[PDB]
Every structure is written in structure tokens, then in C-alpha cells.
Design a protein around this ligand. Structure first.
Ligand code: SF4
Ligand code: SF4
Ligand code: FCO
Ligand SMILES: [Cl-]
Ligand SMILES: [Fe+2]
Ligand code: NI
Ligand SMILES: [S]
Lengths: 279, 484
């Protein structure tokens, strides 16, 4: 196996999707970086900087045109001619996220929209915003760019959803080639672009407190772990994720055990899941 | 322009969080001017308006996935005040355990995964290559290898820190476990065993590897204690309450400027916007009257970061600021290595002297010393916490109220202010750590802290201007926090 080149571009992100990836257990992030992918551009962790880092990405992109994977973290703001997200400068000219996605988007093998912001707009697109924050797939489509997009949402996603999707795609490509493998990846996506291995089961239907929900036994304070969390605001009933089973951070907790689910993987997050602390 | 003055632009500045451009002017081999530009805006202060105020303690964390527990903390403290909620003693301690664990994560992440490549050559594969041809990497084969081995081990250690956060915080990034009224999960005896077992591994790494390597690497870069002083002015607003009466805190508040210590008065904070992309009529506001009206085309402005000033002073924040203001005893290993490697006799932090403390390498030293200091605080909270004792109250949303939460994020002072009207957020204003550090000029033309600290930085080779971003990284910037 040969580690494919990956560029990780951040738009209107919080870097939470990079940090969650650093928490991957099996494989560890060291193994991902040294054995699974070749992370050629990533502003948070790479050695080089500035125009030199941009030029390096461009040189790899030219050499591996059609073959590199493009990870997008954050939404893409279109208002004000892209000025709400400037990601770099080269040749004495600023590079907006709009510009960058139009440059690299057409030439990637596939775009992985990591996190709810990139997948669906997320908090930057929520009520009260004014930057034109746009989801990756919509931005690409609006600009005539047909490159396949896989959504890996969550705010943040679990590391296993990101790494697992990368591995699923690379394994499909090993088996059926680039075009055939990407066609197989698209077949495992739901109607919101999400891989069904991680997003095909509903939290509530699989929740350990479902018996209490059915019995009408509800907690009135967060620290009462006996009752169902519905009255405290749990959005498990309308959320598709496998958190009930893999849990978070090495299996030590998850949102429903600790507090409530806020529906962070869903296309309407946050506004359609708010208020968070009532039903 | 002018003959002899050469402009260098670096965008993106990498191995920080978020979107930053640095532009410097070099003359006679040194930086003589600087401008920092935060190039990405989201507008959390307007997104928050109209919401149930309780939602804030989730929404605000998405300002920054590196320091979300700091925003959670500032938000719930502001909401506690606005709602009249009395956090139970055991919930105060649980909050400190959740947030303190991310101080460990964040400082380790910063030194190894963001900063160490400034001094250490990584493996010959992306993302560790390519890099500047003359990267000024001075370590021996053996010490460089130790740096690489520790970088790799630190990937595990920082992950374990996030397991510690999640034990009572639910998950990380973006905890579920802090709310108005306290913490959502009472610590059990079994989960306290799990937290302590992980803490022991982190403690061992901090004591045996991290603190020693910072001094050891620093001893090969002694020139980096002689640059980066800037204004030599610092702010601390207090953090980690140690009682239920709001008095004693692990880090006590204070301001240091022009060689003088003075108390912190939050009414002296104002945010200027002349050089920021916000409407001119919003300049000069204290956070209780803050306004966020973007103006991305405004002539002369160069950043989405506002310019906070403290009674007109341009100050810095972070580990150096807190350790200088509070002046704790240095760690045993630090005292010994200061003597053995530098010839410095020191017992308390200020024994480094102002010049060496307020320096590029001094800020890395302060962060390592603070990490060691936090170990003792967390040990104290593990002794103090009581399994099974309630950690939360369930207050109703007030119809009209205000509240302010002050804390210290890993990178420096953080406050959140909330005004509630008709049971909804009427205003929410955030003044964050990298805002204090990475801001542009104010309406008086005075540079921000990092802009000023860049003055004098050596650039003997314009084609390999490595010390510009090295200085910036010493402040551990996150531009998501700075702009929000
Ligand atoms: S509402 Fe939440 S806590 Fe209750 S059964 Fe459904 S997912 Fe579980
Ligand atoms: S339990 Fe809900 S809020 Fe928590 S990570 Fe899963 S989907 Fe997101
Ligand atoms: N640490 C951290 Fe985040 C920043 N800067 C805040 O506040
Ligand atoms: Cl934090
Ligand atoms: Fe602000
Ligand atoms: Ni931050
Ligand atoms: S941060």
C-alpha cells in the first residue's frame, strides 16, 4: 500500500475536527500519519509555513492531480467576496477559502467534509450569522464542481468516524480502483452524505435509557442518572450516530450518560436542536 | 517603502490554531515593524443573540476546539451570576477537574505538536518535510531523537488528558458536563480511580520528560531569552476558584506594567477597532456595552481581532503573565536545570528576571513550569472531591439579568459577559486570551502584544526568516478564540 496525499484545509472551523482526530486510539494518530496517509498540508501541524506551505501543496496537487484527497474543516463563507475567511497568501495575493476550494476541489479524488460546519454549515451558518457560511457540498455544486463529497459530521466527529471513513475509502480503492472504489463509497452513504457504518443507527432506538423513556421515568436534574434525559433536552430521538456504543474518548463517557445529546451530527444543528436544555 | 527595509508576509502562520497572517519589516537584520492579521470571522456574539441563555455554554465552545473548556467555564460562570445559581461545593471542584485536565492537554499539545518542530527535525516524511532549507535546528543527534521520541509519546499523553476531561465532562472536544448551576455528573469512586490512574501517567511524563526537555532545548537556544520582550506588561483575571465565596483562586488576579504590580479592575477594559474590520462607531467599548458589527471593507483595518486595552495599556496574557503575576515557587527540576544549564539561581518565578521571563524562550519555560504547577492543583482537587456529593442545581432562566464570568484559559485571560432580556440573550460579549495577545493596533496606534514582541527579533536571513513565527508560536495563539 502507498499512502495517498492529503491536504487539510480549514475554513470557518474551530480546529475541533483536527483535535478529535488526534484522539484516535486504534489506529493511533502516529500510525495514521506514518502508515495510512501522507498529510502534505495541514496548517495546525505541518513543519513549513506561509507561501512555502501553499507552494508545496500546489506542487503535490499538480503531481497528484485527480489522486489527492481534500479534507475540509469548517464552513465556506461567500459574503463580502470571500473576505470572512482568508487562508493564505502567495504571489502577493490573498487566498480566500472560496478561492482555495475552487482551485483544489476540481482536482481532488474526493472531498471529505469533516465536521458539521463543513458538512451542513453548522454554527457559522446558524441564525444571527452574517458571513454566508456555506456547506462544502453546496458550495462545490453551486460552482459547477462535481468531485464526490463524503460528509463526516459531528461537532466534533468522533475520531473513529473520520479515520474509519478514510480507511473504508482507501480499502474500497484497493479493491476496485479509484473510480470503482469511490463509487462503492458513495453507495454506503445516507441521504445526508454520511457513511452508514457510523450514522446508520438512531441514538434513541439504541439508548440504554429507552426503557425509562417508555415508562415515563424522567430525570429532573442532570445528576440523576436513573431516568431518561428527554425532559432535560436530550435530542437522541432525532439523531443518527453510534455514540451509544463506541462512546467517547477511549470509551470513558458519552453525552447521554453525562448530560444530554445535542444532536451534533444532524444537518439542522444547532438551530433545529435548540434550545438544548428543554424538549 | 524605504531603502534597507524589507517586508516579509507569512500567511498562513502554521503550528498555531486558526488563521493568522504576520507581516514584518526587516532592517539591519532585525524586525523593525509588525502587523498581525486574524483573517477568519464567524461572529459568535451575534449568533448567540435571541437564544435561550443556557445554550451559550454549548455554543461558545465552538469558538475553539483546542480550549473549549475555557469558554465553557467562562460561560457557565457568567450564567451562574445572571441566574443567581449557587454552585454546590462538589460541583466547583468537579469543574476544576474537568478544566484543569485540559490545561495539561493544551500545554503538552502546544510544546510538542505546535512548537517543538521549531527546534527539532522530524522524520523525513510529511507533515515534517519539506521545511526551510536553513531551519536553524541546533540539537545533537541524540537530543533531536529525544525530541522526536517525546513528540510521539506526547501524542498518547495529550490523548489521555482528554480522557481525563471526558470522565466528568462527557466528551472532548466540547464538553457536555458544565452547565449553569455546576457540573452534570457527580464523580463516583470508580471514575475517580480512573481519573487518578490517567493523571499519574500524565504527571510522570510532565515531570520526567516535558519540563526537563524545555529547559534542555532552551539551553541550546540561549539567544532566544534575549529577544521578544515587547511591552513587558501582563494581565491575569483569576481562575480556578478554591472556595465558594469567590475570593481565593489558584491564579489570583493582577496587572503588571512598567515594573509595577497593580490590582485588576475589569471596568478598565475597552476594545478598540480603528485597525479592525468592525464599524467605526463601535470603537472604545467596555465589554458590558460591547458591539460586534463587521466591516470587512473598512479602509485601513487589517484584522478581525479587536484591540483590547487595559486602562490604555497593551498587555499580554498566558502562562508567563500568570506565573509572573502570581510568582509561585519554581519546580524542583526547573530550579536545578536553571542552575546546571544556565547558571541561574532561582527559587520563585520572578528570579528569572523580567528580561529572560518576557522572552521568546521564557514563554515556553513559563508554560512548562505552569504545567508542573497544575499537577499540584489537580492533586489537591483529587484530595478534596467527594464521591457521590451533588454537583448541580437546576435554576430557572431569569427574565432579565446580566453576568460576567472571568477565568484563565490555557493561553490567558478570558471573560464572557451576558445580558438577558425577555429570557433570551440580548448581548453576549467575549474577550479572550489570544485577543489580548494577537490583536492589531488600537485607535492610538499602539501595537498589540505580539506585534510589539516581534520588534527586535533577529532575521539574519530573509530567505529563512524562522524567528518571526518562532516568536509568534511562543505565545501559543489560537485565532479562533481571538476573533470568535
Ligand atoms: S431521550 Fe435521550 S436519554 Fe431518553 S431514551 Fe432517548 S436517547 Fe436515551
Ligand atoms: S451523543 Fe449526540 S451530541 Fe454527543 S457526540 Fe453523539 S450525536 Fe453528538
Ligand atoms: N486557551 C485558549 Fe482560547 C485562546 N486564546 C481562550 O480564551
Ligand atoms: Cl481550555
Ligand atoms: Fe469579542
Ligand atoms: Ni482557543
Ligand atoms: S486555543
Amino acid at each position: 500500500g502507498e499512502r495517498p496525499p492529503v491536504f487539510w484545509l480549514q475554513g470557518q472551523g474551530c480546529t475541533g475536527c483536527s483535535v478529535t482526530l488526534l484522539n484516535s486510539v486504534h489506529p493511533s494518530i502516529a500510525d495514521v500519519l506514518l502508515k495510512v496517509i501522507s498529510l502534505e498540508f495541514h496548517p495546525t501541524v505541518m513543519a513549513w509555513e506561509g507561501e512555502h506551505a501553499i507552494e508545496h501543496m500546489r506542487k503535490v496537487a499538480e503531481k497528484f492531480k485527480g489522486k489527492f484527497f481534500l479534507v475540509i474543516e469548517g464552513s465556506v463563507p461567500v459574503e463580502a467576496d470571500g473576505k470572512y475567511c482568508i487562508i493564505g497568501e502567495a504571489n502577493h495575493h490573498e487566498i480566500s477559502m472560496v478561492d482555495a476550494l475552487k482551485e483544489f476541489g476540481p482536482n481532488a479524488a474526493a472531498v471529505l467534509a469533516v465536521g458539521t460546519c463543513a458538512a451542513y454549515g453548522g454554527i457559522p451558518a446558524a441564525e444571527g450569522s452574517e458571513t454566508g457560511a456555506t456547506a462544502v457540498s453546496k458550495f462545490l455544486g453551486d460552482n459547477g464542481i462535481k468531485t464526490p463529497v463524503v460528509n463526516i459530521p459531528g461537532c466534533p466527529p468522533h475520531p473513529d468516524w473520520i479515520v474509519g471513513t478514510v480507511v473504508l475509502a482507501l480499502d474500497a480503492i484497493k479493491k476496485n480502483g479509484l473510480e470503482g472504489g469511490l463509487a462503492e463509497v458513495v453507495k454506503v452513504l445516507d441521504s445526508d452524505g454520511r457513511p452508514t457504518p457510523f450514522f446508520g443507527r438512531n441514538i434513541h432506538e439504541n439508548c440504554p435509557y429507552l426503557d425509562k423513556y417508555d415508562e415515563g421515568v424522567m430525570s429532573a436534574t442532570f445528576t440523576d442518572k436513573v431516568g431518561c434525559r428527554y425532559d432535560l433536552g436530550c435530542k437522541g430521538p432525532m439523531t443518527m450516530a453510534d455514540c451509544f456504543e463506541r462512546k467517547w474518548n477511549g470509551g470513558v463517557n458519552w453525552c447521554v450518560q453525562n448530560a444530554v445529546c445535542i444532536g451534533c451530527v444532524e444537518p439542522d444543528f444547532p438551530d433545529g436542536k435548540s434550545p438544548f436544555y428543554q424538549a | 517603502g524605504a531603502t534597507g527595509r524589507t517586508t516579509i508576509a507569512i500567511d498562513p502562520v502554521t503550528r498555531i490554531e486558526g488563521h493568522l497572517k504576520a507581516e514584518v519589516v526587516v532592517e539591519n537584520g532585525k524586525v523593525v515593524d509588525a502587523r498581525l492579521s486574524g483573517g477568519m470571522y464567524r461572529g459568535f456574539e451575534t449568533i448567540l443573540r435571541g437564544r435561550d441563555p443556557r445554550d451559550a455554554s454549548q455554543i461558545v465552545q465552538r469558538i475553539c476546539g483546542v480550549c473549549p473548556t475555557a469558554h465553557s467555564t467562562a460561560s457557565v460562570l457568567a450564567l451562574d451570576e445572571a441566574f443567581g445559581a449557587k454552585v454546590p461545593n462538589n460541583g466547583r471542584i468537579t469543574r476544576n477537574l474537568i478544566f484543569g485536565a485540559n490545561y495539561l492537554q493544551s500545554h503538552i499539545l502546544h510544546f510538542y505538536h505546535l512548537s517543538a518542530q521549531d527546534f527539532v527535525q522530524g522524520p523525513d516524511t510529511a507533515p515534517f518535510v519539506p521545511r526551510f532549507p536553513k531551519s536553524d535546528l541546533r540539537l545533537s543527534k541524540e537530543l533531536n531523537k529525544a525530541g522526536v521520541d517525546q513528540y510521539i509519546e506526547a501524542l498518547e499523553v495529550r490523548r489521555i488528558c482528554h480522557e481525563m476531561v471526558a470522565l466528568f465532562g462527557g466528551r472532548m472536544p466540547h464538553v457536555q458536563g458544565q452547565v449553569v448551576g455546576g457540573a452534570t455528573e457527580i464523580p463516583t469512586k470508580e471514575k475517580l480511580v480512573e481519573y487518578a490512574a490517567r493523571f499519574k501517567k500524565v504527571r510522570d511524563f510532565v515531570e520526567q520528560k516535558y519540563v526537563p526537555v524545555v529547559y534542555t532545548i532552551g539551553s541550546k537556544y540561549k539567544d532566544m531569552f534575549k529577544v521578544g520582550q515587547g511591552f513587558k506588561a501582563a494581565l491575569c483575571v483569576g481562575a480556578f476558584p478554591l472556595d465558594n465565596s469567590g475570593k481565593k483562586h489558584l491564579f489570583m488576579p493582577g496587572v503588571y506594567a512598567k515594573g509595577k504590580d497593580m490590582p485588576f479592575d475589569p471596568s478598565k477594559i475597552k476594545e478598540y477597532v480603528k485597525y479592525s474590520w468592525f464599524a467605526e462607531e463601535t470603537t472604545g467599548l467596555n465589554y458590558k456595552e460591547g458591539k460586534t458589527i463587521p466591516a470587512p471593507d473598512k479602509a485601513g483595518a487589517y484584522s478581525f481581532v479587536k484591540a483590547p486595552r487595559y486602562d490604555g495599556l497593551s498587555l499580554e496574557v498566558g502562562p508567563l503573565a500568570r506565573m509572573w503575576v502570581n510568582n509561585p515557587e519554581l519546580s524542583p527540576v526547573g530550579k536545578k536545570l536553571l542552575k546546571d544549564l544556565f547558571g541561574i539561581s532561582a527559587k520563585k518565578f520572578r528570579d528569572l528576571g523580567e528580561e529572560a521571563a518576557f522572552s521568546l524562550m521564557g514563554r515556553h519555560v513559563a508554560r512548562a513550569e505552569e504545567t508542573y504547577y497544575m499537577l499540584g492543583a489537580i492533586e489537591g482537587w483529587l484530595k478534596e472531591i467527594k464521591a457521590g456529593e451533588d454537583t448541580v442545581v437546576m435554576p430557572a432562566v431569569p427574565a432579565s439579568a446580566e453576568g460576567t464570568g472571568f477565568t484563565e484559559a490555557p493561553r490567558g485571560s478570558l471573560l464572557h459577559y451576558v445580558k438577558v432580556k425577555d429570557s433570551k440573550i440580548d448581548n453576549y460579549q467575549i474577550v479572550s486570551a489570544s485577543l489580548w495577545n494577537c490583536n492589531p493596533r488600537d485607535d492610538m496606534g499602539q501595537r498589540g502584544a505580539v506585534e510589539e514582541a516581534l520588534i527586535g527579533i533577529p532575521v539574519d536571513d530573509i530567505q529563512n526568516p524562522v524567528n518571526v513565527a518562532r516568536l509568534i508560536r511562543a505565545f501559543d495563539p489560537x485565532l479562533g478564540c481571538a476573533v470568535h
